Amino acid sequence: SMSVKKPKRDDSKDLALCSMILTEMETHEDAWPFLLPVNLKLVPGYKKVIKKPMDFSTIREKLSSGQYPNLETFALDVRLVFDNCETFNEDDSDIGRAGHNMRKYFEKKWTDTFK
C-alpha cells in the first residue's frame, strides 16, 4: 500500500530474455502455423470466430517497439496464439498438434527462465 512495498524484483533483463524465448519459438520446426498472421481474406470463418488474432511476427513487432508493459502481457499474447489455434483447429490435425507442442515448449521455457 502507500509507502509499503515488497522488495524490488530485478526486471531489467526481462526484455532480453522474452526476445530469446521468442527466438526459440520462431525457430522451432512446428512454428510454421504461427509465424505470420492468418490471412483473413483467404481463411473462411477466421475473422468472425477469432476475435483477437495473434501470431509470432506480431508479437515480435510489439516486443521490439515497447508495446509490452511487462513480461506478463508478453506471456498473455503467446498463450493467445495457442488458444486461438485450439479454438479453430481439431486436436487431431497437423496444426492442432503443432499448437499443443508449441504451448508445451513455451511453458517450459517460461518456468525455467522466470519461476
Rosetta silent file (secondary structure, phi, psi, omega in degrees, C-alpha in Angstrom):
SEQUENCE: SMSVKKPKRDDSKDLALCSMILTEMETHEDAWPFLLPVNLKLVPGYKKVIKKPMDFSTIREKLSSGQYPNLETFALDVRLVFDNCETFNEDDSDIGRAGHNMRKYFEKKWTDTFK
SCORE:     score description
SCORE:     0.000 S_00000001
   1 L     0.000 -169.999  178.794    0.000    0.000    0.000 S_00000001
   2 L   -48.808  117.452  179.950    1.094    3.681    0.258 S_00000001
   3 L    66.628   16.955 -179.559    4.821    3.814    1.295 S_00000001
   4 L  -133.529  103.783 -172.731    4.737   -0.060    1.898 S_00000001
   5 L  -127.520  134.798  165.578    6.422   -2.126   -0.805 S_00000001
   6 L   -55.203  152.869  177.047    7.559   -5.726   -1.319 S_00000001
   7 L   -56.573  141.627 -173.469   11.288   -5.976   -2.179 S_00000001
   8 L   -71.625   97.569  157.898   12.169   -4.875   -5.845 S_00000001
   9 L   -47.918  129.970 -176.452   12.402   -7.948   -8.234 S_00000001
  10 L   -78.853  109.887  178.832   15.063   -7.278  -10.923 S_00000001
  11 L  -106.049    8.376 -171.248   13.112   -6.910  -14.188 S_00000001
  12 L   -69.548  -22.351  173.726   15.993   -5.250  -16.132 S_00000001
  13 L   -95.552   -0.485 -175.794   16.713   -8.444  -18.165 S_00000001
  14 H   -57.994  -48.800 -178.905   13.063   -9.317  -18.914 S_00000001
  15 H   -54.622  -48.520  177.856   13.050   -7.729  -22.419 S_00000001
  16 H   -64.695  -43.700 -179.624   16.144   -9.618  -23.477 S_00000001
  17 H   -69.013  -40.377  174.685   15.023  -12.872  -22.017 S_00000001
  18 H   -60.352  -40.165  176.496   11.455  -12.637  -23.662 S_00000001
  19 H   -59.233  -42.138  178.493   13.290  -11.909  -27.031 S_00000001
  20 H   -66.214  -45.636  173.569   15.345  -15.070  -26.569 S_00000001
  21 H   -55.714  -45.929 -176.624   12.330  -17.199  -25.761 S_00000001
  22 H   -65.497  -38.713  172.176   10.536  -15.753  -28.789 S_00000001
  23 H   -57.686  -41.898 -178.048   13.634  -16.580  -30.988 S_00000001
  24 H   -69.651  -36.882  174.546   13.490  -20.178  -29.791 S_00000001
  25 H   -67.736  -45.115  176.713    9.750  -20.344  -30.602 S_00000001
  26 H   -55.800  -33.544 -175.348   10.356  -18.742  -34.081 S_00000001
  27 H   -97.516   -3.711  174.883   12.987  -21.404  -34.944 S_00000001
  28 L   -65.421  140.654 -177.462   11.076  -24.477  -33.700 S_00000001
  29 L   -63.847  -22.299  179.085   10.173  -26.774  -36.575 S_00000001
  30 L   -95.834   13.481 -179.758    6.457  -26.741  -35.626 S_00000001
  31 L   -76.096  -20.530 -168.994    6.277  -22.904  -35.557 S_00000001
  32 L   -51.138  -32.422  176.260    5.100  -22.649  -39.249 S_00000001
  33 L   -69.730  -12.625 -163.994    1.328  -22.255  -38.490 S_00000001
  34 L  -117.105   -4.918 -171.147    2.176  -19.321  -36.149 S_00000001
  35 L   -69.301  -33.588 -173.531    4.914  -17.305  -37.926 S_00000001
  36 L  -131.950  156.441  173.458    2.576  -14.869  -39.737 S_00000001
  37 L   -57.870  140.447  176.322   -0.905  -13.544  -39.292 S_00000001
  38 L   -60.958  134.229 -175.878   -3.692  -15.849  -40.577 S_00000001
  39 L   -79.053  105.030 -173.142   -4.848  -14.413  -43.943 S_00000001
  40 L   -68.722  -19.030  171.417   -8.374  -13.173  -43.064 S_00000001
  41 L   -78.158  -30.352 -171.952   -9.317  -12.875  -46.783 S_00000001
  42 L  -105.097   -4.588 -177.100   -8.356  -16.478  -47.550 S_00000001
  43 L  -121.164   97.053  174.454   -9.441  -18.480  -44.478 S_00000001
  44 L   -50.022  134.480  173.683  -13.201  -18.660  -44.226 S_00000001
  45 L    92.314  -22.462 -170.816  -14.566  -18.247  -40.727 S_00000001
  46 H   -64.445  -46.882 -177.995  -11.349  -16.903  -39.089 S_00000001
  47 H   -57.337  -47.748 -178.809  -12.270  -13.248  -38.991 S_00000001
  48 H   -71.922  -38.650 -174.193  -15.660  -13.802  -37.330 S_00000001
  49 H   -80.154  -39.046 -170.452  -14.703  -16.537  -34.971 S_00000001
  50 L  -100.825  100.431 -166.398  -11.252  -15.412  -33.696 S_00000001
  51 L   -74.703  -28.728  176.265  -11.860  -12.150  -32.010 S_00000001
  52 L  -129.701   85.632  179.044   -8.198  -11.381  -31.220 S_00000001
  53 L   -63.505  143.671  177.902   -5.796  -12.870  -33.874 S_00000001
  54 L  -151.336  148.796 -177.375   -2.163  -13.148  -32.725 S_00000001
  55 L  -152.943  167.224 -175.591    0.995  -14.586  -34.292 S_00000001
  56 H   -65.478  -39.045  179.704    4.797  -14.635  -33.601 S_00000001
  57 H   -63.578  -36.473  174.403    5.607  -11.848  -36.119 S_00000001
  58 H   -67.981  -41.971  174.815    3.038   -9.536  -34.429 S_00000001
  59 H   -65.844  -40.434 -179.289    4.463  -10.397  -31.006 S_00000001
  60 H   -63.365  -40.027  178.598    7.965   -9.718  -32.321 S_00000001
  61 H   -66.929  -44.635  176.169    6.938   -6.276  -33.632 S_00000001
  62 H   -58.242  -45.617 -179.746    5.121   -5.419  -30.330 S_00000001
  63 H   -59.905  -52.188  179.393    8.216   -6.543  -28.374 S_00000001
  64 H   -62.208  -18.489 -171.308   10.670   -4.564  -30.490 S_00000001
  65 L  -117.688   15.531  177.929    8.577   -1.324  -30.242 S_00000001
  66 L    64.240   33.928  176.951    7.882   -1.249  -26.464 S_00000001
  67 L   -92.722   -3.612  167.584    4.321   -2.295  -26.629 S_00000001
  68 L   -97.328  115.338  177.620    4.580   -4.853  -23.736 S_00000001
  69 L   -67.631  -28.374 -178.017    4.416   -3.081  -20.379 S_00000001
  70 L  -158.469  173.127 -174.891    5.703   -6.119  -18.537 S_00000001
  71 H   -66.331  -24.843  178.702    6.610   -9.842  -19.049 S_00000001
  72 H   -69.976  -34.615  179.259    3.021  -10.993  -18.182 S_00000001
  73 H   -69.096  -30.847  178.245    1.414   -9.059  -21.048 S_00000001
  74 H   -66.389  -47.228 -178.865    4.031  -10.816  -23.294 S_00000001
  75 H   -63.067  -37.231  178.896    3.033  -14.305  -21.959 S_00000001
  76 H   -60.611  -43.685  173.682   -0.690  -13.448  -22.500 S_00000001
  77 H   -66.074  -41.077  176.620   -0.108  -12.818  -26.268 S_00000001
  78 H   -58.369  -49.974 -174.814    1.985  -16.009  -26.656 S_00000001
  79 H   -64.900  -33.064  175.854   -0.820  -18.033  -24.945 S_00000001
  80 H   -58.229  -39.163  178.461   -3.415  -16.245  -27.147 S_00000001
  81 H   -57.960  -45.429 -176.847   -1.632  -17.707  -30.206 S_00000001
  82 H   -77.347  -35.377  169.887   -2.237  -21.219  -28.797 S_00000001
  83 H   -60.666  -45.232  170.967   -5.729  -20.590  -27.535 S_00000001
  84 H   -57.867  -43.716 -178.472   -6.737  -19.310  -30.946 S_00000001
  85 H   -60.528  -44.228  178.974   -5.177  -22.378  -32.537 S_00000001
  86 H   -66.230  -36.386  174.308   -7.225  -24.703  -30.241 S_00000001
  87 H   -58.548  -39.858 -171.427  -10.400  -22.737  -30.986 S_00000001
  88 H  -100.903  -16.946 -167.950  -10.049  -23.214  -34.772 S_00000001
  89 L  -125.035  136.474  175.325   -8.192  -26.491  -35.288 S_00000001
  90 L   -62.683  142.619  172.970   -9.039  -30.056  -34.441 S_00000001
  91 L   -52.732  -40.550  179.865   -6.604  -31.650  -31.871 S_00000001
  92 L   -92.751   63.885  172.369   -6.008  -34.472  -34.439 S_00000001
  93 L  -143.359  162.290  177.205   -4.662  -32.212  -37.265 S_00000001
  94 H   -61.020  -44.675 -177.264   -1.130  -31.186  -38.068 S_00000001
  95 H   -68.428  -38.632 -179.005   -1.842  -27.567  -36.954 S_00000001
  96 H   -60.855  -48.493  179.097   -3.765  -28.732  -33.804 S_00000001
  97 H   -64.608  -40.878  175.151   -0.770  -30.897  -32.768 S_00000001
  98 H   -53.655  -47.003 -177.453    1.698  -28.111  -33.651 S_00000001
  99 H   -62.776  -44.064  175.365   -0.200  -25.831  -31.260 S_00000001
 100 H   -63.738  -42.629 -179.445   -0.123  -28.231  -28.366 S_00000001
 101 H   -61.222  -46.536 -178.600    3.616  -28.928  -28.908 S_00000001
 102 H   -65.854  -38.669  178.188    4.497  -25.213  -29.049 S_00000001
 103 H   -62.985  -47.832  172.145    2.489  -24.372  -25.933 S_00000001
 104 H   -54.655  -48.912  176.397    4.362  -27.085  -24.023 S_00000001
 105 H   -55.353  -47.174  178.493    7.694  -25.828  -25.351 S_00000001
 106 H   -60.969  -45.905 -170.847    6.804  -22.262  -24.351 S_00000001
 107 H   -69.828  -35.007  171.251    5.569  -23.076  -20.852 S_00000001
 108 H   -63.669  -48.573  176.344    8.772  -24.960  -20.001 S_00000001
 109 H   -58.771  -38.440 -177.496   10.988  -22.087  -21.177 S_00000001
 110 H   -64.395  -49.995  177.529    8.780  -19.649  -19.279 S_00000001
 111 H   -62.399  -48.411 -179.440    9.026  -21.592  -15.960 S_00000001
 112 H   -65.290  -32.407 -179.219   12.766  -22.278  -16.331 S_00000001
 113 H   -81.186  -37.352 -164.836   13.518  -18.655  -17.142 S_00000001
 114 H  -121.255  -18.952 -176.733   11.234  -16.812  -14.688 S_00000001
 115 L  -108.523    0.000    0.000    9.856  -19.178  -11.867 S_00000001
